[PDB]
Symmetry: D2
Subunit: 121 residues, 4 copies
């Protein structure tokens, strides 16, 4: 399993030691408080009131937790994924990323604490 922190201001994302392989079932739990710039903070589902101004992930709110698996596009994580299997041919290290507009990560604040494990399969 992996446990660690993902900073909201980390545009490249936080690489984990989890390599997602074909058939793996994973569970992710995310917690904490972060901002994409405002003095307010939001949890891992982000800000449901804020429009999408060009986010790295269009299927999650600004300020949500998302991930990439190897060379994949972004995949929503939000609060977490329960005994999840990847629906397509994605493989490789999981990187956790804060959902914001590229180039705008420098004013971000806070972090999420994340746990990832592989479940029985």
């Amino acid at each position: 399993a992996w446990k660690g922190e993902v900073l909201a201001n980390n545009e490249a994302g936080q690489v984990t030691s989890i390599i997602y392989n074909p058939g793996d079932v994973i569970t992710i739990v995310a917690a904490g408080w972060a901002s994409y710039g405002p003095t307010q903070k939001w949890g891992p589902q982000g800000d449901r009131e804020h429009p999408d101004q060009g986010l790295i992930c269009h299927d999650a709110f600004c300020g949500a937790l998302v991930m990439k698996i190897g060379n994949s596009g972004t995949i929503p994580v939000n609060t977490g994924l329960f005994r999840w299997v990847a629906p397509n041919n994605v493989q490789g290290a999981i990187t956790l990323i804060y959902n914001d507009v590229p180039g705008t990560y420098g004013n971000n604040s806070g972090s999420f604490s994340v746990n990832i494990g592989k479940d029985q399969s």
Copy 2:
């Protein structure tokens, strides 16, 4: 495993089919949007800005997800618990409850979607 919804306006809480026994390891993932009265909604960590005016759980914000195990006191869940073991002698059905002040659940709105499973042990 159990998957279901917990309404924010449900003062008694949502009973699950998970019976927590000694030594069990459980994982919980919670998602969604709810309110303790305001037109705004918050995720399963609740409203970090709102004071505790007498909540059922003093160790989580107003609007957070909490639980009881059998006859226990409230236990914070928030976004979830990863491969969690109960630290004391608690046993029995898990009930999920929205964290609000007793008697004030009638103006609540929304719900959380929750998954609970027992992990390998």
Copy 3:
């Protein structure tokens, strides 16, 4: 003319030196930031999102500026009134009041700066 400060925690209200007499025309300008309890602050129009939970003035938002003129009920002031005449039979000293629920003024803070003058008539 009168200028002074209306404290949000002043339940009885701020008496002014203005005695409203029949036929008088008055102008009020109010400015500043105050709270009825929450960490946020609002201007003299108060909080348009907050329901009326027993306000002293049901025709203005919580945290708005209101007034009484001698024997009157509360009258909304908000940001002010321009060359305003009172209703029939309304006369006497103007008192300015923060619009909130009686008995809850103890957790209020901030204040409004207010000017009142009598206009030509």
Copy 4:
């Protein structure tokens, strides 16, 4: 005297019938709700939580009411000005403007109701 509406999406501003002449004393009262983009609305003091990202007036919040008088730079109005005199060499038609970032007025909404009069002098 002048009364009218200042649209938040009106980048050039709302011209008034008031010509500010040397030695004039004026009173302005402004009221209402507007937005510079977000779902929320703010009064004529604007949004005290939002940083200045290139406002036309750096001495008022985003979403505040401001003015120009003939050749002047922007001057804060907020909720209004009581028996106010202009700085040296400031004269001409008063234009009222919603304080926002140039080129972003297209996603604004709402308006302020404004009265201006000349006072005795």
